Structures are given as C-alpha cells and as structure tokens.
Design an enzyme around this catalytic site. Structure first.
Site, PDB file in Angstrom:
ATOM      1  N   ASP A  83       0.834  -1.211   0.000  1.00 33.72           N
ATOM      2  CA  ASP A  83       0.000   0.000   0.000  1.00 33.72           C
ATOM      3  C   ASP A  83       0.874   1.269   0.000  1.00 33.72           C
ATOM      4  O   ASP A  83       0.648   2.215   0.758  1.00 33.72           O
ATOM      5  CB  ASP A  83      -0.983  -0.019   1.192  1.00 33.72           C
ATOM      6  CG  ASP A  83      -2.100   1.033   1.075  1.00 33.72           C
ATOM      7  OD1 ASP A  83      -2.301   1.608  -0.019  1.00 33.72           O
ATOM      8  OD2 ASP A  83      -2.772   1.303   2.092  1.00 33.72           O
ATOM      9  N   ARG A 106       0.167   9.248   0.870  1.00 32.99           N
ATOM     10  CA  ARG A 106      -0.571   9.264   2.138  1.00 32.99           C
ATOM     11  C   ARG A 106      -0.003   8.308   3.196  1.00 32.99           C
ATOM     12  O   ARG A 106      -0.224   8.520   4.377  1.00 32.99           O
ATOM     13  CB  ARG A 106      -2.070   9.019   1.930  1.00 32.99           C
ATOM     14  CG  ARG A 106      -2.409   7.608   1.530  1.00 32.99           C
ATOM     15  CD  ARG A 106      -3.862   7.412   1.145  1.00 32.99           C
ATOM     16  NE  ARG A 106      -3.991   6.031   0.679  1.00 32.99           N
ATOM     17  CZ  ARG A 106      -3.742   5.597  -0.559  1.00 32.99           C
ATOM     18  NH1 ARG A 106      -3.399   6.436  -1.545  1.00 32.99           N
ATOM     19  NH2 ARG A 106      -3.853   4.294  -0.816  1.00 32.99           N
ATOM     20  N   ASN A 107       0.724   7.274   2.772  1.00 36.87           N
ATOM     21  CA  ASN A 107       1.388   6.344   3.678  1.00 36.87           C
ATOM     22  C   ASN A 107       2.880   6.575   3.874  1.00 36.87           C
ATOM     23  O   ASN A 107       3.561   5.727   4.458  1.00 36.87           O
ATOM     24  CB  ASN A 107       1.097   4.917   3.216  1.00 36.87           C
ATOM     25  CG  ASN A 107      -0.374   4.597   3.284  1.00 36.87           C
ATOM     26  OD1 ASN A 107      -1.075   5.126   4.128  1.00 36.87           O
ATOM     27  ND2 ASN A 107      -0.847   3.750   2.393  1.00 36.87           N
ATOM     28  N   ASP A 164       2.668   2.596   7.331  1.00 30.67           N
ATOM     29  CA  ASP A 164       1.275   2.215   7.118  1.00 30.67           C
ATOM     30  C   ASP A 164       1.177   1.065   6.121  1.00 30.67           C
ATOM     31  O   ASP A 164       0.420   1.106   5.155  1.00 30.67           O
ATOM     32  CB  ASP A 164       0.469   3.452   6.676  1.00 30.67           C
ATOM     33  CG  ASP A 164      -0.837   3.613   7.428  1.00 30.67           C
ATOM     34  OD1 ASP A 164      -1.407   2.600   7.870  1.00 30.67           O
ATOM     35  OD2 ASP A 164      -1.299   4.767   7.566  1.00 30.67           O
TER      36      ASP A 164
HETATM   37  C1  LIG Z   1       3.776   0.620  10.807  1.00 34.08           C
HETATM   38  C2  LIG Z   1       2.340   0.173  10.892  1.00 34.08           C
HETATM   39  C3  LIG Z   1       2.068  -1.178  11.055  1.00 34.08           C
HETATM   40  C4  LIG Z   1       0.759  -1.640  11.139  1.00 34.08           C
HETATM   41  C5  LIG Z   1       0.493  -3.088  11.312  1.00 34.08           C
HETATM   42  C6  LIG Z   1      -0.375  -3.819  10.453  1.00 34.08           C
HETATM   43  C7  LIG Z   1      -1.159  -3.350   9.273  1.00 34.08           C
HETATM   44  N1  LIG Z   1      -0.433  -5.082  10.825  1.00 34.08           N
HETATM   45  N2  LIG Z   1       0.378  -5.175  11.906  1.00 34.08           N
HETATM   46  C8  LIG Z   1       0.532  -6.464  12.562  1.00 34.08           C
HETATM   47  C9  LIG Z   1       0.951  -4.006  12.229  1.00 34.08           C
HETATM   48  C10 LIG Z   1       1.888  -3.827  13.373  1.00 34.08           C
HETATM   49  C11 LIG Z   1      -0.263  -0.703  11.055  1.00 34.08           C
HETATM   50  N3  LIG Z   1      -0.048   0.613  10.898  1.00 34.08           N
HETATM   51  C12 LIG Z   1       1.221   1.057  10.817  1.00 34.08           C
HETATM   52  C13 LIG Z   1       1.374   2.513  10.644  1.00 34.08           C
HETATM   53  N4  LIG Z   1       2.393   3.146  10.165  1.00 34.08           N
HETATM   54  N5  LIG Z   1       2.068   4.500  10.201  1.00 34.08           N
HETATM   55  C14 LIG Z   1       0.869   4.568  10.702  1.00 34.08           C
HETATM   56  N6  LIG Z   1       0.117   5.635  10.942  1.00 34.08           N
HETATM   57  C15 LIG Z   1      -1.121   5.549  11.702  1.00 34.08           C
HETATM   58  C16 LIG Z   1       0.403   6.895  10.266  1.00 34.08           C
HETATM   59  C17 LIG Z   1       0.935   7.861  11.295  1.00 34.08           C
HETATM   60  C18 LIG Z   1       2.167   7.651  12.024  1.00 34.08           C
HETATM   61  C19 LIG Z   1       2.611   8.546  12.945  1.00 34.08           C
HETATM   62  C20 LIG Z   1       1.848   9.715  13.197  1.00 34.08           C
HETATM   63  N7  LIG Z   1       2.055  10.733  14.032  1.00 34.08           N
HETATM   64  C21 LIG Z   1       0.989  11.572  13.847  1.00 34.08           C
HETATM   65  C22 LIG Z   1       0.113  11.098  12.905  1.00 34.08           C
HETATM   66  C23 LIG Z   1      -1.153  11.668  12.395  1.00 34.08           C
HETATM   67  C24 LIG Z   1      -1.198  12.924  11.790  1.00 34.08           C
HETATM   68  C25 LIG Z   1      -2.396  13.436  11.319  1.00 34.08           C
HETATM   69  C26 LIG Z   1      -3.579  12.717  11.435  1.00 34.08           C
HETATM   70  C27 LIG Z   1      -4.887  13.272  10.923  1.00 34.08           C
HETATM   71  N8  LIG Z   1      -5.264  12.743   9.603  1.00 34.08           N
HETATM   72  C28 LIG Z   1      -4.934  13.693   8.536  1.00 34.08           C
HETATM   73  C29 LIG Z   1      -6.686  12.400   9.549  1.00 34.08           C
HETATM   74  C30 LIG Z   1      -3.532  11.469  12.037  1.00 34.08           C
HETATM   75  C31 LIG Z   1      -2.340  10.948  12.511  1.00 34.08           C
HETATM   76  N9  LIG Z   1       0.667   9.893  12.481  1.00 34.08           N
HETATM   77  C32 LIG Z   1       0.223   8.977  11.547  1.00 34.08           C
HETATM   78  O1  LIG Z   1       0.356   3.355  11.012  1.00 34.08           O
END
Ligand SMILES: Cc1cc(-c2c(C)nn(C)c2C)cnc1-c1nnc(N(C)Cc2ccc3ncc(-c4ccc(CN(C)C)cc4)n3c2)o1
Ligand SMILES: [Cl-]
Ligand SMILES: [Cl-]
Ligand SMILES: [Cl-]
Ligand SMILES: [Cl-]
Length: 275
Positions: free
Chosen positions: A155, A159-160, A173
């Site tokens: 993905d 955005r990611n 992400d």
């Molecule tokens: C690395 C990872 C892994 C997995 C995963 C999966 C699938 N399976 N398994 C077993 C796992 C462990 C799932 N997600 C991730 C992940 N990587 N990055 C993210 N994020 C959520 C993005 C992120 C990261 C840091 C962060 N600081 C602040 C924000 C932020 C900023 C603005 C907004 C508001 N907006 C615009 C609406 C929101 C948040 N921000 C946003 O999630």
C-alpha cells in the site's frame, strides 16, 4: 530450530505493557479503527509522545497473526522506514480483543497532506524540485531496505509516507486501485515489482504536488485503461529524466521494471545534477 528461534526472539520485544501508555485525543477515526495521540513511559523514566493506532476476524488465530506480523515490522531498522515501537492488546467488554500499534509521533504528518498544504498560503512554503526529489530518494531508500529483506509493503502511496521532524520521509502504514500494478489487478499476484509500480505512482503524486492519479478515469475503468497501454501523463514542467524514471516503474512486463536499488541510484544522480 533457527527459524523458530528467530521468530520467538522477535515476539519477545514487541509487546508493551498497557500501564506504560497514556492515551490522548483522537486524531483520525474511521471504518478500520482510530489514531490517537499518546504518551509512552520509557525505560529511562521519561515519556515520549506517540501515535496510537487501534485496529478492528476477532479470533485468537487473527491476534496471533497480528503479533507475529508486528514482530517482523518491529525488527525493521532504517531511517526511511517508520519504526514500530510496539503493540498493546486492550480488551473489550464483549470479549473482543482490540490491538493497538504504537508509533513515533510525526507532527508534520503524512507527505500527501503536506504537499497539498504547500499550495495554500498558511501551509508550508512552496516546495522546490530539489526537495521533491529528496522525498523520492528517501522513499526509494526505505523501499530498497524493505525489498532487500523480502518485505512487500502492499500500500505504497504518498498518504502512507510520513515526514519526520528533520523533513526525512519514511515509508509507513504497511498494507487504492489507482496504485495497483496491472498484473495485480489481473491475477491477484503481488511482488516487489508491484511495489515498484506503486512507487512510480507515488513519484507522480509528489511531482504533481498531490493530484489524485489518472484524472478523468474512474476506478472501475482502471484495468481496461492500463490494458490498452495508457499510463499516468507527464506533469507540467516535470523533467523528462524524472518522467522516464517514473514511467519505467509501469512497464507491462514486471521483469522489465527496475529494482528499487536501481531507481534509487537514478534518483540520487538526477538530484546531484540539479543546480
Ligand atoms: C507501521 C504500521 C504497522 C501496522 C500493522 C499492520 C497493518 N499489521 N500489523 C501487525 C501491524 C503492526 C499498522 N499501521 C502502521 C502505521 N504506520 N504508520 C501509521 N500511521 C497511523 C500513520 C501515522 C504515524 C505517525 C503519526 N504521528 C501523527 C500522525 C497523524 C497525523 C495526522 C492525522 C490526521 N489525519 C490527517 C486524519 C492522524 C495521525 N501519524 C500517523 O500506522
Ligand atoms: Cl520512525
Ligand atoms: Cl520525528
Ligand atoms: Cl490536486
Ligand atoms: Cl494521468
């Protein structure tokens, strides 16, 4: 054996005690789950600001898959790949377990939103070509690392990708029809060369400063559109060299697309050549 040994070692480091974690306000929320600000109390006494992602197959089997997958991601160590700090599994009153992913907080947010805000007066300033190319190099570096260790992102999109405080981009992400390679639309098949295709689309997003891919083409039209050889058009004032690089990511035969390592060299070279 060693395969089981390496797995069990990784599973040790990944869990965080819920009591070391304070939740804050909701930053984003939808069908998949929620993202919240939080504090993680560390081994050195001090607290760290974190982002906490809660995620929705409710069974024990699914939880074990999640923890295992999380163990692998926790093992990544590269400045252009987001570092997973750990996971917490909170429980619901109906017996349904709720997994939570703990991440470093990125105040500048995702790259796509940042590109769009840069076209608004109050947002970050206009982004020069050198910086856009640097974003692409950073992403190519992260993906090069990931494909070396045979991890498929699934993905990849602007955005990611997340911006750190030093404006370094990291891929995040881990897994959107318009980012999916033609063969993966066809056969449901996915390689590192499918990730390369997505990367080209991501390069195009960055060079257009956040345009949605394929204006005037519907998601349901995407397979037939690509089947007839049509590809993302060259953005206005985009270097032909840069366009050739992104175009090479969408060659029909997956084996003809370059590797991330190759692309990364090409991007650094082009970046070097700019005044
Ligand atoms: C690395 C990872 C892994 C997995 C995963 C999966 C699938 N399976 N398994 C077993 C796992 C462990 C799932 N997600 C991730 C992940 N990587 N990055 C993210 N994020 C959520 C993005 C992120 C990261 C840091 C962060 N600081 C602040 C924000 C932020 C900023 C603005 C907004 C508001 N907006 C615009 C609406 C929101 C948040 N921000 C946003 O999630
Ligand atoms: Cl990070
Ligand atoms: Cl940071
Ligand atoms: Cl736009
Ligand atoms: Cl287009």
């Amino acid at each position: 054996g060693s395969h089981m040994e390496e797995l069990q070692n990784k599973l040790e480091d990944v869990v965080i005690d819920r009591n070391l974690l304070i939740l804050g306000r909701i930053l984003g929320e939808g069908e998949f789950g929620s993202v919240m600000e939080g504090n993680l109390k560390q081994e050195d006494g001090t607290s760290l600001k974190v982002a906490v992602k809660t995620m929705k197959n409710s069974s024990q089997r699914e939880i074990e898959e999640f923890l295992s997958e999380a163990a692998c991601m926790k093992d990544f160590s590269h400045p252009n790949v987001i570092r997973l700090l750990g996971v917490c599994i909170e429980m619901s009153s109906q017996g349904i377990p709720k997994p939570m992913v703990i991440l470093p907080f990125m105040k500048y947010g995702d790259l796509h939103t940042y590109l769009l805000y840069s076209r608004l007066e109050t947002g970050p300033r206009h982004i020069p070509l050198q910086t856009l190319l640097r974003f692409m190099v950073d992403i190519a570096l992260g993906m090069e690392y990931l494909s070396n260790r045979n991890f498929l992102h699934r993905d990849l999109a602007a955005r990611n990708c997340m911006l750190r405080d030093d404006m370094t981009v990291c891929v995040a992400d881990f897994g959107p029809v318009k980012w999916i390679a033609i063969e993966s639309l066809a056969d449901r098949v996915y390689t590192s060369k499918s990730d390369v295709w997505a990367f080209g689309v991501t390069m195009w997003e960055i060079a257009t400063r956040g345009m949605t891919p394929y204006p005037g083409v519907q998601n349901h039209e995407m397979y037939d559109y690509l089947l007839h050889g049509h590809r993302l058009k060259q953005p206005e004032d985009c270097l032909d060299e840069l366009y050739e690089i992104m175009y090479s990511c969408w060659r029909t035969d997956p084996l003809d697309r370059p590797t991330f390592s190759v692309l990364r060299l090409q991007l650094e070279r082009l970046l070097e050549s700019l005044p």
